[PDB]
């Protein structure tokens, strides 16, 4: 139950949420036994874990007449939220809003199911240091190490290709097109030049959209490896 929800949340990718001229990175895992949510704004991280009793009570409090079993409510919430998180710019009526409490965050989602209102609220409290660490820091370090290894392998391949080109040149047979000549690859010069020019744009985290759009597969793989 709780362990299953935690594992599901850990094994999910971050999704971009746009709401009231604000951006968030959200990880949501729903199941018949309850849901787990982790929302970050690059400054603070809030975590919520709700079970059947809590979800039913909150649904009754918000929806004064939505008389449905907690499992059905959770299934409907999942069916309404997952399409948005999986792919942005979806044709849905899931409007979102944030209220920043002194310590908590109220994430209000209002949507329409079969042309009828559907309200829900996440009362996300600040995530514990262990959860935030395990979810962001360690996987990010693993991703950085994996990307460094990929860069090293690519550099080795480039060196092999340079050796092949040099061997071809030593034979005295020149190219037919002179515009395809590429200068020999050097790790130090390339790294220095990249850091000089392209680093400011490359490292522009922004509101988190590039992080979700670029390397979510690597994040998922790193997290899965860490779990095992």
């Amino acid at each position: 139950v709780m362990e299953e929800l935690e594992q599901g949340l850990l094994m999910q990718p971050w999704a971009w949420l746009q709401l009231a001229e604000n951006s968030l990175l959200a990880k949501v895992f729903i199941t018949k036994q309850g849901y787990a949510l982790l929302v970050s704004d690059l400054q603070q991280v809030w975590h919520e874990q709700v079970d059947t009793s809590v979800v039913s009570q909150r649904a009754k409090e918000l929806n004064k007449r939505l008389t449905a079993p907690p499992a059905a409510f959770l299934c409907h919430l999942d069916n309404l939220l997952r399409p948005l998180l999986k792919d942005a710019a979806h044709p849905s009526e899931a409007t979102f809003s944030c209220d920043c409490v002194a310590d908590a965050l109220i994430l209000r989602v209002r949507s329409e199911l079969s042309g009828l209102p559907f309200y829900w609220n996440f009362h996300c409290m600040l995530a514990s240091p262990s959860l935030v660490s395990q979810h962001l820091i360690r996987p990010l370090m693993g991703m950085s190490l994996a990307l460094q290894c990929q860069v090293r392998e690519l550099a080795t391949l480039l060196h092999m290709k340079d050796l092949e080109i040099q061997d071809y040149q030593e034979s005295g047979a020149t190219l037919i097109r002179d515009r395809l000549k590429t200068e020999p690859f050097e790790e130090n010069s390339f790294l220095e030049q990249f850091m000089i020019e392209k680093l400011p744009e490359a490292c522009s985290i922004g509101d988190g959209k590039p992080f979700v759009m670029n390397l979510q597969d690597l994040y998922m793989a790193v997290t899965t490896q860490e779990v095992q």
Partner: protein
């Protein structure tokens, strides 16, 4: 003045069909009167503009959308992908209808109907209205059929005339 009759199956007794008639002056927005009868006893109630507005505000939806949903439910306007459950507690004389949807029940409306002491009068009035409506519809259909026959004869005549004219 407009009226609309419909047949429903109360979940309390899923063995007989109850006839509910909704009568409104000019439009459903201004209000309506609901009369539900099982053939022996009748229960009548009224809903005004204020009640509809309060219900729409409570459920947090546009007045037009709520009125459209109410028309779709009560006036037998339900489409293919929709289902509604109507239940009437006679002991409390409390009627209410909800929209069943994928193991999720949403309360759509609720009224308090007071039993009338003369169900015979209302039953006879409903039967008379139905008889008048069917008679008027039959007369209109007969007139339209006669007009169609006349137009078909005229069309055949003119078509033959054009054939002869073009031939000559």
């Amino acid at each position: 003045m407009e009226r609309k009759i419909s047949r429903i199956h109360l979940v309390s007794e899923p063995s007989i069909t109850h006839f509910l008639q909704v009568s409104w002056e000019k439009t459903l927005e201004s209000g309506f009167v609901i009369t539900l009868t099982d053939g022996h006893s009748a229960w009548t109630g009224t809903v005004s503009e204020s009640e509809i507005s309060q219900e729409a505000d409570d459920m947090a939806m546009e007045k037009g959308k709520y009125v459209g949903e109410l028309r779709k439910a009560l006036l037998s306007g339900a489409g293919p992908a929709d289902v509604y459950t109507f239940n009437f507690s006679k002991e409390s004389c409390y009627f209410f209808f909800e929209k069943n949807l994928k193991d999720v029940s949403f309360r759509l409306g609720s009224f308090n109907l007071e039993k009338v002491e003369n169900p015979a009068e209302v039953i006879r009035e409903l039967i008379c209205y139905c008889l008048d409506t069917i008679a008027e519809n039959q007369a209109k259909n007969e007139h339209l059929q006669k007009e169609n026959e006349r137009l078909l004869r005229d069309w055949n005549d003119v078509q033959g005339r054009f054939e002869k004219c073009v031939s000559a």
